Structures are given as structure tokens and as C-alpha cells.
């Protein structure tokens, strides 16, 4: 995916226009750059089981970018040329492709769709065509029911991954009566509820977290 980061794009242009004259004669600069770009463009392209590398988030892409600029700066700062330059430059492009594939594997291990319940939307970048699209994690809206007990304050709806989802404007929830009717108690950017001076008249609830254009994010029932 590093070919989609403008830092890598501008770096390789500066690599050819300035630093290749320090290591290679001018007759093969274009030939070497075609070999360099073919390796970079293969980053994250899910060929073959290697399905997790197909896309990464914006946090992973910046790690691979600054890891790549670190090694590209190492190649230029050396004074090795000849058959050793092409050899080290090729081991470099092969090394960063492994560093990237670790980040993409670590991404899908603990960051890609970590939601235990509900629908989550994550911002991803697809490495083949450099297209950034909203990815949808489809889990059942039913996040179970809580049995909170509180007379003389009474409802936590936030999940640990709610802070990381995208498109979440505000959470609104109501009180489902025995008549199966819903009355919107409150709606706001607050991820909880607190009503002072509770009484024996407040004895079923239901939370609803709403996205912009992806439906309801999470719903959570309650028994007080």
C-alpha cells in the first residue's frame, strides 16, 4: 500500500533524479527504476491464503511508509555501487515487503474488525488500486441484555470499540414499555445514561447506536 503514500511517491522521484547518479552510471537509471517500482507496486497485492494483506488502515500504512523511507535513506547514504548496489537495493525492497507483510498480518490479527457485537465501519486503503473505502464488519446488532439494579441514580451502552468506529454521530435510546412501545428518553453524543432520584416506577430499556449511512451500529437491551 506504500505506493499510495505521497511520501513514498516523492521519495522515489528524488531517488532517481538525485541519488542514482551517485551509485549508477546514467545508462541504466530508467532500467533500475522500473525494477524498483515493480517491487513497490507489489506491496499488499493479495496473490495466491495471503488474504489479510489486501488492505490496511491509515495507521499501518504510515508505519510501513516511515519504515520504507528509513531504508531508502540507508541505501542512498551508503557509498556502495556496482554489483553490490543492485544487490543491497534488491535486498532492501525485499526486506520492506516483509516488514509490510508483518504489519498487514498484525493488522488483521488485532485491529481488523475487533467488534464482538454489532456493525462496525473502518477506514481502509486497498493496496492494488490505492482506493480508500469504508469497510463494514457485519455482526448481529443484538449485544445481549444487561440486568442493572439501582431507589434514591440509574445505563452504560458504550462498547470498547465504539470509539474506533467511523460514521457514529450520536446514540439514541428509548424505554420499551410492557405495551411494546418506545419513548425516546434521551439522544446525545454521550455514551451512557444517568437519571437522578430514581423511583420504583422506572422498573425494560433498549439502546440504539446509529451511523450516518450504514444503519444502526449497535443495539443493547436492559432489564432494570
Amino acid at each position, epitope marked *: 500500500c506504500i505506493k499510495c503514500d505521497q511520501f513514498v511517491t516523492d521519495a522515489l522521484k528524488t531517488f532517481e533524479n538525485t541519488y542514482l547518479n551517485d*551509485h*549508477l*552510471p*546514467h*545508462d*541504466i537509471h530508467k*532500467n*533500475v527504476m522500473r*525494477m524498483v517500482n515493480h517491487e513497490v507496486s507489489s506491496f499488499g497485492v493479495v496473490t495466491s491464503e495471503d488474504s489479510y494483506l489486501g488492505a490496511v488502515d491509515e495507521n499501518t500504512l504510515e508505519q510501513a511508509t516511515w519504515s520504507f523511507l528509513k531504508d531508502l535513506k540507508r541505501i542512498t547514504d551508503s557509498d556502495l*555501487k*556496482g*554489483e*553490490l*548496489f*543492485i*544487490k543491497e537495493l*534488491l535486498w532492501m525492497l525485499r526486506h520492506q515487503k516483509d516488514i509490510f507483510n508483518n504489519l498487514a498480518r498484525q493488522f488483521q490479527k488485532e485491529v481488523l474488525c475487533p467488534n464482538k457485537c454489532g456493525v462496525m465501519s473502518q477506514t481502509l486503503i486497498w493496496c492494488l488500486k490505492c482506493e480508500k473505502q469504508l469497510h463494514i464488519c457485519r455482526k448481529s446488532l443484538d449485544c445481549g441484555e444487561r440486568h442493572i439494579e439501582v431507589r434514591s441514580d440509574l445505563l452504560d451502552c458504550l462498547l470498547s470499540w465504539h470509539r474506533a468506529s467511523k460514521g457514529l454521530t450520536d446514540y439514541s435510546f428509548y424505554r420499551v414499555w410492557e405495551n411494546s412501545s418506545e419513548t425516546l428518553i434521551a439522544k446525545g453524543k454521550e455514551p451512557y445514561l444517568t437519571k437522578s432520584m430514581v423511583g420504583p416506577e422506572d422498573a425494560n430499556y433498549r439502546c440504539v447506536l446509529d451511523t450516518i449511512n450504514q444503519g444502526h451500529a449497535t443495539v443493547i437491551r436492559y432489564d432494570v
Partner: antibody
Amino acid sequence: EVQLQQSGAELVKPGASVKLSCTASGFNIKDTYMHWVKQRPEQGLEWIGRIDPANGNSKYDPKFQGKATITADTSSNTAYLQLSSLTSEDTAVYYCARWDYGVYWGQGTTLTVSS
Amino acid sequence: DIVLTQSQKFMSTSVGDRVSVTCKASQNVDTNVAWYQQKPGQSPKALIYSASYRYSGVPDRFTGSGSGTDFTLTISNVQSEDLAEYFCQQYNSYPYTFGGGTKLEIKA
């Protein structure tokens, strides 16, 4: 058009020393490493060493360090290979090559060592 | 010194079949092997660098693979102009070694 025209055929007595040359065209010699290789019909190819005429440094196959000395003239675009203490085992064809994203050889120089 | 051995001294083929030269390294070269073609009398010509990457002038029928210890150079569609000797060369460590040759003769 990159071309490497090296020295002509040499024929010398055992013990003498030859300095076979190699002139480069189409690229500056200082922007690259330049290697020397000997070839015999029975023992195959053997890598001798390299040189970068930018810094004058040369690396060798340790079994050829007592005989070969690869020097170069950065202003004349010419790489030289000197072989000292010449014996009959040195009768071979000697190639000079450029090696930086591509290998460009010379036509080869035939060294014949016999009294 | 690393010892590259091409087992087949030289192997036969036909005017259209595919041929595949192999050479084994006594140590781990780790994709640092080149291949050369040398017709008799002339200097060799470089075909492949880093075991898989091919130079511009080389025809696409030539292709190489292999990693670590075993390397194979495969000519997919030979022609009479490809009948020559082929060398593999390890440049992973000093000194660079060249191993034996392999001449692609035609069966008769």
C-alpha cells in the same frame, strides 16, 4: 552504445609479467566496479577480482592475490590486469567486465605462457 | 569457497522442447545467483540476475528460478540460436564462484 575493447593476444615466457588492459566506452569507468575473469577449457571460469577506479580499491579471490593486481586509470577509462610470476597454469583467456545492473564483457585476451 | 555444481555436464534437447539447467550450491546463496550464456570463442552474455530477474535484451523464453541452494535456468522454447554453454554464478559471498558449464546440444 557501451563497448569494452581490451588488449591484444599476449605470448610470454614463464616468470615474466604481463599487463593486459581494457578500455571502456559508453560509460565513465569511475561510476562503477570492473571485474576480471579467467577462462580455461578444462577448469571453467574463475573470478579474479574487481576494482572501483573512483577510490582505487580492489578485492580479489585470495588464491589469485599473489599473482593479479587490478589497477585502473580513471582519466583514460581503462582497467588493467597485471599478472606476475607467470607460470604455465596461467595460460587462459582473460575477460574484463563491467557490473552494475548488467554485465558488459570485453572480447577477451588470450595469454599463452610457455618457454 | 562455495562450490556450485551443475550435475549434467551437458544435456541434449530438441529444436522446440523446453530445457532446464540446474546447479547446486554447497551453501546458502539466498537468491544471489546469475546466469550467463557463452557461445564458443566469444565472451559470455548475462541473462539473469538474482535468480529470477532478467536483463532487458534477453528474450522472454529464458527464465530462472530457485532459492537457497537449488537453482534452475529454464529455456522455454529453444531455437538454434540458443545452442551454447550456460553457467550459474554465486555472488552472495567472496570469492565469487562459477561452477561447471552446461552445453545445450541437440539430440541425434
